[PDB]
């Protein structure tokens, strides 16, 4: 996809993550955990809500009958009306197909971008204390307990504290 995360360097989604669209799984000395990310999830949902608000509607134009259900109308004007209505149908059928195809492309790529923006925020946060494994994970080169893992998820992780330890382990 456009941003290379969803159906990209992230191998697959987590069916187990029922409390969000994006989030984190961790492994440290204490064990493993999973948590959803609220801000990224809500950013994707809000943008999709915006589309539904714009798309799920009709015009307030009041149309009246120009065709009889139960009787014959003039043949020649009937031919003009048939040509016109079929021309309008072809336009709306085409417009509908293009709208949904275009919107669907954008929805999928927008969702991809939100996954990458979270990945990128965490990368810049960890600075020189972690390395990418190419699978959507960061290998952290210091002891990072449950409170440390929370600081990363909460966007409050301070790289400066762990830098000396991380660089020693990275360079051996």
């Amino acid at each position: 996809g456009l941003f290379g995360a969803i159906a990209g360097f992230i191998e697959n989604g987590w069916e187990g993550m029922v409390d969000g669209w994006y989030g984190f799984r961790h492994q440290n000395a204490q064990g493993t955990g999973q948590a959803a990310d609220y801000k990224s999830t809500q950013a994707a949902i809000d943008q999709i809500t915006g589309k539904l608000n714009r798309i799920i509607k009709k015009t307030n134009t009041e149309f009246e009958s120009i065709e009889s259900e139960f009787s014959e109308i003039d043949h020649q004007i009937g031919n003009v009306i048939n040509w016109t209505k079929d021309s309008i149908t072809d336009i709306w059928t085409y417009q509908a197909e293009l709208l949904v195809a275009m919107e669907n492309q954008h929805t999928i790529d927008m969702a991809d971008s939100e996954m990458l923006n979270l990945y990128e925020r965490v990368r810049k946060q960890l600075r020189q204390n972690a390395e990418e494994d190419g699978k959507g994970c960061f290998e952290i080169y210091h002891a990072c307990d449950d409170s440390c893992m929370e600081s990363i998820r909460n966007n409050t992780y301070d790289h400066s504290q762990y830098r000396e330890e991380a660089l020693l382990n990275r360079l051996n």
Binding site: N12, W14, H26, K58, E62, A96, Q105, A111, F138
Partner: protein, 320 residues
Amino acid sequence: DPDKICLGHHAVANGTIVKTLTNEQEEVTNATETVESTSLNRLCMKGRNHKDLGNCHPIGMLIGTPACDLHLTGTWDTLIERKNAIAYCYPGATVNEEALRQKIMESGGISKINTGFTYGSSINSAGTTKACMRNGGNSFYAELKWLVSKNKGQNFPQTTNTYRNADTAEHLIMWGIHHPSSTQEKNDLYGTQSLSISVGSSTYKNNFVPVVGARPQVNGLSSRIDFHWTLVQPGDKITFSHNGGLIAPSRVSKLIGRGLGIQSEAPIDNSCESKCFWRGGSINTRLPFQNLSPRTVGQCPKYVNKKSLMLATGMRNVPE
């Protein structure tokens, strides 16, 4: 050896297929329909002063067919016409029929104004027929008097009848012309004299002569009564000069304001509300498109040649 934090996204066991610019079979976590496939088999008339004509055809309201006796006048914002509805009890048709029907179904009511037409002793203004009945006896179109000469064979006299439009709005006047089945029938009803019917206003001048010719038996009758109509402008007058064959108007019509005309087979429901109607009933969907019918009236989703069109409401579904 080193600790790890992994970033990910959700998936679902049962994803949904949508189309994109690039992919005809793209699986996403969720999608929603944009084309309405379903309708209510009922006319949702809540918040509308509506009129259900039933067996009464709109044109029957103006000429006053027995079937239309309850719909000769009134006001409405919505008018509902039904299939097989009756206009003509006596066999025949209106010239420029569809134009009249559309004008009535465009209207927000019908007012009736007396022509004030009164006829000499030589004329009986109560001609009746088996084809048009009410109260278990031969009758006629309520809004037109069938003018007959008293003596069989005796000439219907040269009569003049003028309607003056004293109103500030145009009035719709209708009249019928008789077309005998046999040369005998023509001479029987209106005499041997060569019949002529002239209709003259400032904006309308026309001449009618009953064409003698045997048509097929319809409602047990071989002859025909064909209807004609025009508009009388404010302050103008329309004159009928005739010597037999004219079916003369007793009242003229005024169409009041505007309303929504609906042609539907679906029964009335006063409990529910709608802005969109078709032959099959009411469309109350919030979706932008519909595939029920290209023929709708009101504020409607746009018709499309599509069964389904799914809008993605989630990311790519990449299951485990």
